[PDB]
Write a protein that binds this ligand. Structure first.
Ligand SMILES: CC1(C)CN=C(N2CCN(c3ncnc4sc(CC(F)F)cc34)CC2)S1
Length: 466
């Protein structure tokens, strides 16, 4: 190592002192990822993992943080001999990146629950020898920075992390595992995944972080959970203040998920004088459209979730339709299961429950109901259209009869006089999927033909013999 200037703010005695540290680091040529991660993990440990003795804020003394830092840098410098990996052109080699990844990996406890909370930071790595998947990638990036490898950066998709490095930052390397029971590809590029148009690699529209975005990632990674029922107010406040710092400095401009997480935080506890959650969700979407070819799914899911929680049925349906309009241009591949789960839950749990409540409120005389609005019926149909188009050309199917039952139920929540108002052109809607085009017929009958809908959604050839 730490430079004299990095040590002057210690000891950190409050949330605001932590913020000052982040501000100072973000004003340097290269914010110190190892320092920042250790500090966050320290404070998260004593605010969420073990609050015994807590009276206000766990004071971070320089002696403690410097000793942690020293343990990290000694482990990396000792295990990674740079002389073995000459740096042609001031850039790193694939062998070097693999070596660092191996060092982190080989350091981890043989057996532990990999999706436990509070195993994301370098504090967990040093004190517990435990990291979660994306924590391994971050730690490889922190280790490379500590070694002076200015070219190695964190790459992020909506469900995975890896690194970029090399000439022009153009190389990619896997450095961690993905999911559960997948075969790891550490050391390889991500080009096969990009080529197959999976959600996992976002068709190449994944995030290539700079150092400041790496800081935003560790701040997003703060986990305020104490247990299932309780969050640390202190950590929520810290994460929120740090996200605003990053926002003000321009460092969330290319980070849609961070803007969504900040909006979620503001919904819980708004900061006076700041943009509304809805504004922030829309900025997240704008970020995805501007920097990532509008190929991200979660910016629309964050917005829909807000509208959902506020029982704005119309706007939630619109946002979910827009989510499906993104997914339609992907191929559903092995390893995309997390997004399938999200779409399944929306279709088969969240929407049904929203519409059930809407039906009850309609019975009690509501006005302007989504169930009387043909634009809302159109959004529902557009959501299913994108899911069907997603399925087209995919190596694994998406729909099955489990989805058909909920589709029939959801359609039926709208009276025929409402459904009849949507014009399906080859409120107006154009279908992209062949499944929904063949369904058009069935979508306006007063009584929905349940069996025909099921046949059309699942492309089941036949009915019961006997
Ligand atoms: C609309 C949702 C279902 C609500 N929370 C969502 N999240 C999406 C994942 N979150 C994230 N937030 C900031 N950065 C990242 S990077 C990353 C991938 C990982 F492998 F590095 C995930 C993620 C935050 C939680 S999506």
């Amino acid at each position: 190592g730490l430079k004299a200037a990095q040590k002057t703010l210690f000891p950190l005695r409050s949330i605001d002192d932590v913020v000052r540290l982040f501000a100072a680091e973000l004003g340097r040529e290269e914010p110190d990822l190892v320092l920042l991660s250790l500090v966050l993990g320290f404070v998260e440990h004593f605010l969420a993992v073990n609050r015994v003795g807590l009276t206000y804020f766990p004071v971070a003394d320089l002696s403690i943080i410097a000793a942690l830092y020293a343990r990290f840098t000694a482990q990396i410098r000792g295990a990674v001999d740079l002389s073995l990996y000459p740096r042609e052109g001031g850039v790193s080699s694939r062998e070097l990146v693999k070596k660092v990844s191996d060092v982190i990996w080989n350091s981890l406890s043989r057996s532990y629950f990999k999706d436990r909370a509070h195993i994301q930071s370098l504090f967990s790595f040093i004190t517990g020898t435990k990291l979660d998947s994306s924590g391994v990638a971050f730690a490889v990036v922190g280790a490379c920075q500590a070694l002076g490898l200015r070219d190695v950066h964190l790459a992020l998709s909506e469900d995975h992390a890896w690194v970029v490095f090399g000439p022009n930052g153009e190389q990619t390397a896997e450095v961690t595992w993905h999911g559960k029971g997948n075969e790891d590809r550490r050391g390889q590029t991500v080009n096969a995944g990009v080529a197959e148009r999976s959600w996992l690699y976002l068709k190449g529209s994944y995030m290539r972080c700079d150092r400041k975005m790496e800081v935003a990632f560790m701040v997003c990674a703060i986990n305020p959970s104490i247990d299932l029922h309780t969050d640390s107010l202190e950590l929520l406040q810290l994460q929120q203040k740090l996200l605003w710092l990053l926002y003000d400095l321009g460092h969330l401009e290319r980070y849609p998920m961070a803007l969504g997480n900040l909006a979620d935080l503001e919904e819980l506890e708004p900061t006076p004088g700041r943009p509304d959650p809805l504004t922030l969700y829309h900025k997240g979407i704008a970020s995805a459209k501007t920097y990532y070819r509008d190929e991200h799914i979660y910016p629309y899911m964050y917005l829909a979730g807000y509208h959902c929680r506020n029982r704005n049925v119309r706007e939630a349906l619109q946002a979910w339709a827009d989510t499906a309009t993104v997914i339609q241009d992907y191929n559903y591949c092995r390893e995309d299961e997390e997004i399938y789960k999200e779409f399944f839950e929306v279709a088969n749990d969240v929407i049904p429950n929203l519409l059930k409540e809407a039906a009850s409120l309609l019975e009690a005389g509501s006005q302007g109901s989504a169930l009387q609005d043909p634009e809302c019926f159109a959004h529902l149909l557009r959501f299913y259209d994108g899911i069907c188009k997603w399925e087209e050309g995919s190596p694994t199917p998406v729909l099955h009869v489990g989805w058909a039952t909920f589709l029939v139920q959801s359609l039926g929540r709208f009276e025929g006089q409402v459904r009849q108002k949507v014009r399906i052109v080859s409120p107006v809607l154009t279908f992209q999927s062949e499944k929904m085009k063949g369904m058009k017929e069935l979508l306006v009958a007063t009584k929905i033909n349940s069996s025909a809908i099921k046949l059309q959604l699942t492309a089941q050839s036949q009915v019961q013999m006997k």
